[PDB]
Design an enzyme around this catalytic site. Sequence first.
Site, PDB file in Angstrom:
ATOM      1  N   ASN A  44      19.747   2.995  -2.050  1.00 18.21           N
ATOM      2  CA  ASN A  44      18.865   3.082  -0.891  1.00 18.21           C
ATOM      3  C   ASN A  44      19.588   3.911   0.177  1.00 18.21           C
ATOM      4  OD1 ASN A  44      17.520   0.673   1.528  1.00 18.21           O
ATOM      5  ND2 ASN A  44      16.668   2.621   0.809  1.00 18.21           N
ATOM      6  N   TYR A  77      10.806   8.506  12.056  1.00 14.52           N
ATOM      7  CA  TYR A  77      11.251   7.142  11.949  1.00 14.52           C
ATOM      8  C   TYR A  77      12.036   6.707  13.173  1.00 14.52           C
ATOM      9  CZ  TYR A  77      14.348   3.457  10.118  1.00 14.52           C
ATOM     10  OH  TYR A  77      15.077   2.305   9.936  1.00 14.52           O
ATOM     11  N   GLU A  86      10.369  -1.591  13.911  1.00 13.24           N
ATOM     12  CA  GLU A  86      10.821  -0.465  13.127  1.00 13.24           C
ATOM     13  C   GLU A  86       9.530   0.293  12.838  1.00 13.24           C
ATOM     14  OE1 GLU A  86      12.211  -1.369   9.122  1.00 13.24           O
ATOM     15  OE2 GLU A  86      13.669   0.255   9.228  1.00 13.24           O
ATOM     16  N   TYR A  88       7.279   3.971  11.403  1.00 15.18           N
ATOM     17  CA  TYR A  88       7.235   5.141  10.572  1.00 15.18           C
ATOM     18  C   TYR A  88       5.950   5.921  10.771  1.00 15.18           C
ATOM     19  CZ  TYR A  88      10.655   3.013   7.235  1.00 15.18           C
ATOM     20  OH  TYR A  88      11.742   2.474   6.576  1.00 15.18           O
ATOM     21  N   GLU A 177      14.053   9.169   3.405  1.00 16.61           N
ATOM     22  CA  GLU A 177      14.498   7.883   2.947  1.00 16.61           C
ATOM     23  C   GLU A 177      14.325   7.857   1.445  1.00 16.61           C
ATOM     24  OE1 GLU A 177      13.185   4.452   5.150  1.00 16.61           O
ATOM     25  OE2 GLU A 177      13.263   3.142   3.404  1.00 16.61           O
TER      26      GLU A 177
END
Length: 190
Positions: A44, A77, A86, A88, A177
């Site tokens: 990740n 982001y 958070e 996006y 990402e």
Amino acid sequence: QTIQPGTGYNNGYFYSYWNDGHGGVTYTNGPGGQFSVNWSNSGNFVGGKGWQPGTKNKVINFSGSYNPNGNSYLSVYGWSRNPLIEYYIVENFGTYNPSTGATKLGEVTSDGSVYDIYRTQRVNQPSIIGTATFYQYWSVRRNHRSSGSVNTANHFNAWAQQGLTLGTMDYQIVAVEGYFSSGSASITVS
């Protein structure tokens, strides 16, 4: 040039590069707002350039190529604090639409396409202030692209209209990402 995970400033832009330590990813800061990332059977990771702090009316421009082979996203982001959020604004993605299973909270038209809005919750997950439970807001572009201009105010205003409020802005970047996938990207922010 090629660096290891960390944050800082490069050619006038804030940058953030993080990975889970699995290996398989190379992140490189370029001139100006440029950055590249090449990954092969990675873990990740998140990497990109932008601002610290971001603003609620910024018009972000990005230009480049994005070629994911598997699970990956290309987005504007960032985070807000108090409340901790958070968020996006997804311009493109690979094999997985990140809004899968999420609750749809509206639609917004901006910069040449309709975007679908969603909200999800992260329970006891890492965050900019430590382990916490917080919401994630999403704007997912229907017409995918690797270059363009994003009027963040259109998204933040549409979210607020639906009851998705943001607090004080923290970093705001254009990021690539990836989640256990392969690919390559070369993006220039401005």
